[PDB]
Ligand binder design. Structure first.
Ligand SMILES: [Ca+2]
Lengths: 227, 227
């Protein structure tokens, strides 16, 4: 595996999860990941710049760009490649109400405006594990994580800028979803039902740190290379 | 300036702030930072182990051990050294209600049980910038940070184990406090008043990520060397 880190931009949002499919509905415009040699697809609105990443393997800084699979945009009925994925990692978060989180590291190969827009009927929800300060009695606090699920919305049309050569994170998450496909052993999940916006706390996992689903201090990303 | 990152242990709490002083009251047992050329001191119960840290300076992994100042424990009236500080950084988060935050990287020089015990009268409060998913209408969410302040408590006696050779983070924070002293340029602030548990949101800063006051994705700590 590759350990990944980078300074964040001023006010740059943290990684999060989005869903945009209910029944047969799909978003009008979104970031798409289709399986190699397959027609299956998942969607996302997650697009996070890595301002200046650093890649580390087995304690040594390496150059990832010295077997990739592309990442597309869906723009209406028109899919188009926007970059290539170098590493990805998946993990199941939770027990009786699992959240499947797939993070992919990719480098844009075109400097373009990426349109995001949900289906006209509200279908778009967003997921985040918000770190909380937990106190039981008069002891040292710990960090718990709650699952924040936004209410259903129809994502207003918007333009997001990507630049050739830059690195980007993109999650593909699902709430109690199905195994749609996998790419080089990394599964990709999809859920098709509205998510109850009332959710409890989720026990932390060391893989949720690796995929970036739960924030922690000085904790780098850690994904599998395409192999 | 050194970038630091590390994988977190299973469920390891994220960096938080602690205050333990009101008026002339000081904790019974806590981690102490003394001015290199003075008798001034600040206190904390923050003590977070870095499982397997990596230090990066100007793009390259470095061995930071090849001018340090000690970090002590206060145990009753007794003070004793427990480690040596290799890097530190300071920043203020907020305008009308500022929070002074100093993070110090240090390596333990003894393996023993460190005593934490607040004053008998409640004096201990803890502070955390909890990352939140905020949504304005039907648009992409952002990450805001609220200021979680625990209620006044008297920290129950406890023992925290440290091991010589391991790396530990420790914060020294204040809520609209005074600059007690500085160690190799990095100021250390102290607050001597109970903190109102009702607080608002704090706008992001790049320094908050570097010192680790606000969590972000794949974002390392970045502290100054001792010079
Ligand atoms: Ca002693």
């Amino acid at each position: 595996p590759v350990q990944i880190y980078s300074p964040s931009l001023f006010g740059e949002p943290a990684l999060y999860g989005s869903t945009a499919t209910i029944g047969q509905r799909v978003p009008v415009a979104a970031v798409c990941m289709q399986a190699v040699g397959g027609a299956q697809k998942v969607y996302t609105y997650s697009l996070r710049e890595l301002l200046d990443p650093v890649f580390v393997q087995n304690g040594n800084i390496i150059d990832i760009t010295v077997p990739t699979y592309p990442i597309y945009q869906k723009d209406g009925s028109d899919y188009s490649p926007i970059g290539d994925v170098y590493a990805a990692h998946f993990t199941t978060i939770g027990s009786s109400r699992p959240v499947q989180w797939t993070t992919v590291l990719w480098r844009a190969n075109i400097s373009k405006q990426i349109r995001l827009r949900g289906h006209a009927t509200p279908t778009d929800q967003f997921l985040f594990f918000n770190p909380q300060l937990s106190m039981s009695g008069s002891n040292l606090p710990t960090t718990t994580y709650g699952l924040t699920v936004s209410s259903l919305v129809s994502l207003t049309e918007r333009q997001e800028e990507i630049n050739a050569g830059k690195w980007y994170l993109s999650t593909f998450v699902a709430f109690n979803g199905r195994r749609e496909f996998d790419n080089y052993g990394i599964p990709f999940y999809l859920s098709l039902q509205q998510i109850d916006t009332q959710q409890g706390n989720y026990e932390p996992t060391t893989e949720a740190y690796n995929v970036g689903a739960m924030l922690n201090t000085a904790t780098p990303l850690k994904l599998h290379l395409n192999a």
